[PDB]
Amino acid sequence: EVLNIITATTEIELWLEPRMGVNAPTGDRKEWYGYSEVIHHADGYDNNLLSVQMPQYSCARVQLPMLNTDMTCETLMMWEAVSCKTEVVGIGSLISVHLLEAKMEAGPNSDGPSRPIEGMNYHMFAVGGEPLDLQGIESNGQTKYATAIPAKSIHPNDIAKLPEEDKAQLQGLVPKAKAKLDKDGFYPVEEWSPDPSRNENSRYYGSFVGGLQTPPNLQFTNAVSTVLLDENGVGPLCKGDGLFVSCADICGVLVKADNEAIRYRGLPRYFKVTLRKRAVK
Amino acid sequence: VEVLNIIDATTEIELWLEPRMGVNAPTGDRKEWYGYSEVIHHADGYDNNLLSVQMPQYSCARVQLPMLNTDMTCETLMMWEAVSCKTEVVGIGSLISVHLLEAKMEAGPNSDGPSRPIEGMNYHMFAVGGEPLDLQGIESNGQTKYATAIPAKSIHPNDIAKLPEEDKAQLQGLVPKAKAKLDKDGFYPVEEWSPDPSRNENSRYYGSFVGGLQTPPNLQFTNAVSTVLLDENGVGPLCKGDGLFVSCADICGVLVKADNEAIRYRGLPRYFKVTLRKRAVKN
Amino acid sequence: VLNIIATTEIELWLEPRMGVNAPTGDRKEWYGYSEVIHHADGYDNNLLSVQMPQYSCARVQLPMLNTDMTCETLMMWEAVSCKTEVVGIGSLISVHLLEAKMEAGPNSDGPSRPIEGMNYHMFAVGGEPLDLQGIESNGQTKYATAIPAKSIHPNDIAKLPEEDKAQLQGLVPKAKAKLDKDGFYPVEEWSPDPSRNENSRYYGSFVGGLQTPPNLQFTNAVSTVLLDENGVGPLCKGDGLFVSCADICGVLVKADNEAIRYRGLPRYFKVTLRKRAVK
Amino acid sequence: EVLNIITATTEIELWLEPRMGVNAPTGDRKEWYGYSEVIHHADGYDNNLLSVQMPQYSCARVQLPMLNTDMTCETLMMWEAVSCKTEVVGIGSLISVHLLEAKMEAGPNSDGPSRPIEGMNYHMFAVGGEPLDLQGIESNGQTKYATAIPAKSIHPNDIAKLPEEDKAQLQGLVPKAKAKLDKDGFYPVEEWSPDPSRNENSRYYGSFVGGLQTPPNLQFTNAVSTVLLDENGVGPLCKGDGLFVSCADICGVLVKADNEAIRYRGLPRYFKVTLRKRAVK
Amino acid sequence: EVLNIITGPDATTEIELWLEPRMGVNAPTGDRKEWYGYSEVIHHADGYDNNLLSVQMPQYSCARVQLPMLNTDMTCETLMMWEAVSCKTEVVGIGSLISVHLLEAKMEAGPNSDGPSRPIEGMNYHMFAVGGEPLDLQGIESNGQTKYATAIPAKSIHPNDIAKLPEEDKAQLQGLVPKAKAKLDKDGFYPVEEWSPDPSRNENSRYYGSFVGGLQTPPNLQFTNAVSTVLLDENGVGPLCKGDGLFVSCADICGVLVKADNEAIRYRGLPRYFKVTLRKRAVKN
Ligand SMILES: CC(=O)N[C@H]1[C@H]([C@H](O)[C@H](O)CO)O[C@@](O[C@H]2[C@@H](O)[C@@H](CO)O[C@@H](O[C@H]3[C@H](O)[C@@H](O)[C@@H](O)O[C@@H]3CO)[C@@H]2O)(C(=O)O)C[C@@H]1O
Ligand SMILES: CC(=O)N[C@H]1[C@H]([C@H](O)[C@H](O)CO)O[C@@](O[C@H]2[C@@H](O)[C@@H](CO)O[C@@H](O[C@H]3[C@H](O)[C@@H](O)[C@@H](O)O[C@@H]3CO)[C@@H]2O)(C(=O)O)C[C@@H]1O
Ligand SMILES: CC(=O)N[C@H]1[C@H]([C@H](O)[C@H](O)CO)O[C@@](O[C@H]2[C@@H](O)[C@@H](CO)O[C@@H](O[C@H]3[C@H](O)[C@@H](O)[C@@H](O)O[C@@H]3CO)[C@@H]2O)(C(=O)O)C[C@@H]1O
Ligand SMILES: CC(=O)N[C@H]1[C@H]([C@H](O)[C@H](O)CO)O[C@@](O[C@H]2[C@@H](O)[C@@H](CO)O[C@@H](O[C@H]3[C@H](O)[C@@H](O)[C@H](O)O[C@@H]3CO)[C@@H]2O)(C(=O)O)C[C@@H]1O
Ligand SMILES: CC(=O)N[C@H]1[C@H]([C@H](O)[C@H](O)CO)O[C@@](O[C@H]2[C@@H](O)[C@@H](CO)O[C@@H](O[C@H]3[C@H](O)[C@@H](O)[C@H](O)O[C@@H]3CO)[C@@H]2O)(C(=O)O)C[C@@H]1O
Ligand SMILES: [Mg+2]
Ligand SMILES: [Mg+2]
Ligand SMILES: [Mg+2]
Ligand SMILES: [Mg+2]
Ligand SMILES: [Mg+2]
């Protein structure tokens, strides 16, 4: 039960690095950090699709200053997210036409530029007072996924647990396939969406442009804010004094020269969130 | 100028509409293609019968609201009035996939590249009303051959207009007799039926179409946007029989088959949240 | 134009006039399309009216307002707003179009090319026929000479010598007409005249090319206000409301010669009117 | 020094015919009036680029009613342009797929449509109280231009007069390369832009979409006007009682069947300008 | 500490300037002079089979404008600063992008034809900024191990010149490396493919940018003298000019030229005009 604002503010900022699959600059895949592993047409059919091949949501919880010295009291204060500025950094890097290992965009006897990053763009950011609610889906119900222990990603049927002969249901809406975005680099974009049936205490904003050769269209400015207040003037209220931020920013794909397969490329996203104190019952 | 760098009165209803692209249930022989259409080829409907499973259809539902009037003969009645709605197509991220089962490879013949992703025609419409959505029929080709099914799995404009087969070219324009109510889920093909702008006084509908086979799908998703359903007089749809009627169609593109380059449509589920209030009206 | 004085709503459909303008005769199966167009038509043959999409138009008789037309102060119907919609947009998803080119390799069994390419969409509401200005993309295009005429061309009015018809590639002031006949004025030769049309409102868009994705919307929640900057809408002379449109939604490509047909769709109109006293 | 309005009005109409290169329906090139001459990749390198090959700005001066009985008076009247309606006519003609001499858009054994007009669109219009100020540039500083006595067009270096070895400066910003749009069909669009460093007494509006196969996107209506007043509510003031209108409307190109070279196509533009009387010092 | 605006008849001023593009060939002199306003040629394996040169990497343009001196004594506890209120800015020369007779450019036609050249098209990168101090930049690498030429003196500066990561850790620059930060303090020096405006700083600047990628994308550009950008923030305060300096910067890649003989590319940029309106604002010192 939301009461009146207490007149008292604070701002937090943070960066979320992309989780395109290669999620750390370490090991033998280090050079491909910020990209996915290679994806081929029959992957997941004639082999297991790996987590490194599946771009994932980024997320973090920011701890806010503690508000109530006694959690038993009938009236308490909560942090309320009022507005946010957010930005995808590094967009100029997408002009490169000398991408390592990338297909040449010219005739077979030429010496032209590489294909630049282009194709599918999927951009979403969210700010909320608790983890983002996710709804699960499968483009192909019977896609084969790797089983690592511990798991490196989670899939809708890990939660829905349909019998294998019923997994075609996941190509529609399966209500049991729901989860919270509670782990960075774990929930694949191609299987999980913000759940519009929940998320009463979060705000999310997403866009998608598909295809493999589509020009990426991105903007950057520090002159624009997003107001997080709902129709009643109430922003997300931060349970446990935690602010939750999430995003995904697939900016396109790289095409490999030797087999023409692809890797996704993502870019880091900045957040600046402005909060105020709100009394609640 | 120099060059300077020179060197209970209200209620909320929620529901999901699953897509009806043709394969309309994860059952039977076609179970694995639920949420897609059946395969379509250029001569289908000419050198064979076009099947209902090959024709994406409108989704629709009626939600029973709390009953408002004990005596429906009173000259002043209460009705539910739809004021606004939030709606969203879910699963958009799934459209990034370039490992689509049976799909054509987007690369040279000696390569091992990605599959073609879902792309091409996008047809998106949602509607909220106090009675079934009014539909007007049309045909792109008047003489298209349609399968005869018992029980029938779709209905076509000429099942209503009942024109002689030799006059069916009329259906390529506007045939006033070819009208229907969106009264059955997964039954009215998108390619034959549109919202009827000459009726639908008690419904609101919103549609967009981008054609072509290789067009990049362009879709948005957010929980911070609502659609106001009130008309110019401040009146929203009024729910007859205390029923709220929601409808949609969301073709998100096509898949291209590797073995013959024919296509299947792909659709995605749509969520609705409708906010309603009560209005007294003359009876 | 005096003050307003009560209201009424007019509805109608305009069926497309793409060339094959009736579901009768020998071409009846292509009603709502143009006849086939090839690159050299109008050069090594005569371009037919059935090959040239045309404006649709109608005059709706409104309730008579004045007992005596002699009076110095009369009532006129004033068009205030309108809702308009292109119906049948969903039919443009078809990839099983009769006689259409296959969009796949020569060894495949793929879909047909769908309707796509150039879109030309215009609607107008006025108190008198829409004024048109004529033009030619090619001054010397050869047009058939039917009796009676099935279409009218700019030089039919301007009557320039054959050696001067290159003028029609620019602006010929003599090449003016009124949109007074349905399925008669070709879109490729006639445009709404911005130097006239004081008593009409028109709204048009064009996206060219042969393979362009068609981009259309449909909704019953949007209206167009027809009032001008003085708050005055079109005034219906002779108690007649004049509506006109053209909606080329793209082209079909034929499998056997790769030539094209334009495709059009019907348009709906709902016009709201009020009574206005005039001098 | 601008003073108050004098409360008196007038409306001016005119058409500007396109000047794509073939600027009159006369002479040897008369049948291509409203188009450019044919342009090939090496034109201006292994030959001289001709004025007929370079689309130019259209412009006109409209004489307004004389306002002042005596131009020596300390307070005078000027016509002030307040708003304007403008329209490109003939857009429907761009649907044509039977264009004379044009490449066929089908396989070589077919009998399909011609390529329609498509590709780069350059649309600008301007209304001012004096000629539009232009700034010059060259995409290639060493482009070879024909010499006619008298000249049929004027180029930036005709004004800047840089040594031949210095003409690469014209690929950037050369302040000496300035001109007034004082002659119809004379200033090529590819060499001359509205000068944002001047033009205090004009308003111009321009858009460009490039490429050779881009779908042309054009609108037409009589329900929209452009307001010409500046931030202080002052429109262009007509010096010498002359109103100056300018434009360029490249709507795309035609592709010739026999060599695949191109001609630009333009369309005429209509103007309706509304003016009022303003007192000035 | 921002105080109130100081009203008066001489309280505002206006500044105009041009910035020429820095696509790589940054002066019309020397051996590369005929390609001024373009980049040097770029090929797929450059930076791998060879060193990527500064002339191959478009850079931000920038300038500091000296404003009228405001405070005779910078000792005083209360001072005045120029406050940037609005800006008009325009990319000039857009009409030149219609050319289909580009020197050395690939022919857009069949192999035995005589058609037009490919016009400038492809990726467009447009940004402008106005601030009261240099624009803050954040570094990144699309490929951490890209090979760069090391000239003495340096012709450009790269994110790891500042971050100084070990060579085997440079993959970190493909994400967000907080030490990879710089100020846009030198014209024709910071490549756009390695440096973006830093959204974590730039409190005293305003920047506006767009990108449309790909190699064949139609350039889409507007020009008009009837539109301004308001520079005031949510509290109505514009950038405040430290040391009486106005800082402007930009980058305008309008597309690429494709060479006929190897199909490699050069970027093309165009010059940008600025008109900045400023007013006097009192601040606490
Ligand atoms: C998850 C992962 O490590 N993916 C890598 C894949 C897989 O290991 C591979 O596809 C499994 O079969 O391999 C990638 O590299 C391959 C690519 O360079 C292709 C180009 O044709 O060549 C492959 O190796 C060939 C080898 O050249 C032949 O001699 C023969 O032995 O067959 C092998 C395997 O086909 C490379 O492994 C890929 O891009 O697919 C790199 C991925 O990181
Ligand atoms: C206005 C009209 O009726 N147009 C129809 C045209 C014309 O009759 C024709 O183009 C005039 O020359 O014809 C269309 O049908 C033609 C198409 O099927 C092509 C495919 O190659 O074949 C044509 O017939 C050939 C015939 O096959 C040859 O044996 C020989 O007789 O020549 C004729 C004409 O070239 C069809 O006429 C068309 O698409 O052009 C149908 C139009 O409705
Ligand atoms: C400014 C002008 O008049 N341009 C015309 C050009 C030039 O006269 C020409 O390009 C200068 O060399 O010519 C155009 O017409 C040419 C075109 O039809 C090509 C098609 O291949 O043929 C040319 O003539 C050829 C002839 O066919 C050959 O047999 C041989 O004689 O060589 C000549 C010259 O190449 C036409 O001149 C053109 O489009 O380039 C028409 C322009 O209006
Ligand atoms: C409604 C439905 O079930 N659609 C099927 C269609 C139809 O059954 C078929 O098109 C009717 O002719 O078949 C689909 O599969 C076909 C496809 O794999 C093609 C690939 O070239 O092969 C077809 O089979 C051939 C077979 O290869 C030959 O040995 C045989 O002599 O002829 C067969 C029939 O053509 C497959 O049936 C299709 O995509 O068209 C699958 C759809 O779900
Ligand atoms: C930074 C710079 O000056 N770049 C040049 C480049 C480089 O000098 C070159 O790529 C280094 O290998 O050269 C450019 O021109 C080349 C281009 O014209 C190609 C066309 O095939 O030919 C190259 O020279 C060839 C020569 O023709 C061969 O006979 C010889 O055996 O090898 C030479 C090197 O490949 C030109 O150098 C280029 O566009 O790459 C011009 C740039 O300004
Ligand atoms: Mg809910
Ligand atoms: Mg009605
Ligand atoms: Mg007039
Ligand atoms: Mg100035
Ligand atoms: Mg900060």
Author numbering:
A (entry chain C), D (entry chain E): 38 to 44, 48 to 321
B (entry chain B): 37 to 43, 47 to 322
C (entry chain A): 39 to 43, 48 to 321
E (entry chain D): 38 to 322
Passage from the reporting paper:
Polyomaviruses are small double-stranded DNA (dsDNA) viruses with a circular genome of approximately 5,000 bp. All glycan-binding polyomaviruses analyzed to date engage oligosaccharide (glycan) structures featuring terminal sialic acids that in mammals are usually presented either on gangliosides, which are molecules composed of a glycosphingolipid, i.e., a ceramide and an oligosaccharide, or on glycoproteins, which contain mostly complex and branched oligosaccharides attached to amino acids during co- and posttranslational modification steps. These sialylated glycan structures interact with loop regions at the outer margin of the major capsid protein VP1, at the apical surface of the polyomavirus capsid, as revealed by X-ray crystallography and cryoelectron microscopy. The VP1 surface exhibits an astonishing plasticity, providing virus-specific interactions for a range of Neu5Ac linkage types and further specific characteristics of Neu5Ac-containing glycans.
NJPyV VP1 specifically engages Neu5Ac that is α2,3-linked to galactose (Gal) with a novel binding site that differs in location from the sites in all other structurally characterized sialic acid-binding polyomaviruses. NJPyV VP1 binds the α2,3-Neu5Ac-Gal motif of 3′SL in a binding site that is located between the HI and BC loops of one VP1 monomer. The DE loop, which is elongated in NJPyV VP1 compared to other structurally known polyomavirus VP1 pentamers, is not involved in any interactions with the glycan. Instead, side chains of residues K296 and N299 from the HI loop and residue H80 of the BC2 loop engage the Neu5Ac carboxylate group. Residue E77 interacts with the Neu5Ac C-4 hydroxyl, and the N-acetyl group forms a water-mediated hydrogen bond with the backbone of residue V78. Additionally, hydrophobic interactions between the N-acetyl methyl group, residue L90, and the hydrophobic part of the E77 side chain are seen, but the Neu5Ac glycerol chain is facing into solution and is not engaged by VP1. The Gal ring interacts with residue D298 via a hydrogen bond formed to the C-4 hydroxyl and via hydrophobic interactions of its C-6 atom. Like most polyomaviruses, NJPyV VP1 does not undergo any rearrangements upon glycan binding (root mean square deviation [RMSD] of 0.2 Å for the structural superposition of native and liganded NJPyV VP1 Cα atoms). In our crystal structure, Gal forms fewer interactions than Neu5Ac and contributes only about 30% of the total interface area buried upon 3′SL binding. In the NJPyV VP1-3′SL complex, the Neu5Ac ring is positioned roughly in between the locations seen for JCPyV VP1 and TSPyV VP1, defining a novel polyomavirus Neu5Ac-binding site.
